[PDB]
Amino acid sequence: CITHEDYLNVVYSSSEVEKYLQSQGFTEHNEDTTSNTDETSNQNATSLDN
């Protein structure tokens, strides 16, 4: 009654086992408001002398 039960499958040719679990959560939000204002004017001084 001791736990030195290494009578089968002695793998100590080092055998480094890894694990790498990885989760990720991500939300996002935007609010993009523009507002234009624009006005024009001109003048059209024309002439013709037939």
């Binding site: 624009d38 006005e39 001109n42 059209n44 001084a45 024309t46 002439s47 013709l48």
Partner: peptide, 21 residues
């Protein structure tokens, strides 16, 4: 010019201001 020989001359002046913001 025909074969009287009408002649014309024209001028236009066109400013156009603008702005936007």
């Amino acid at each position: 010019s025909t074969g009287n020989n009408t002649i014309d001359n024209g001028k236009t002046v066109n400013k156009s201001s603008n702005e936007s913001n």
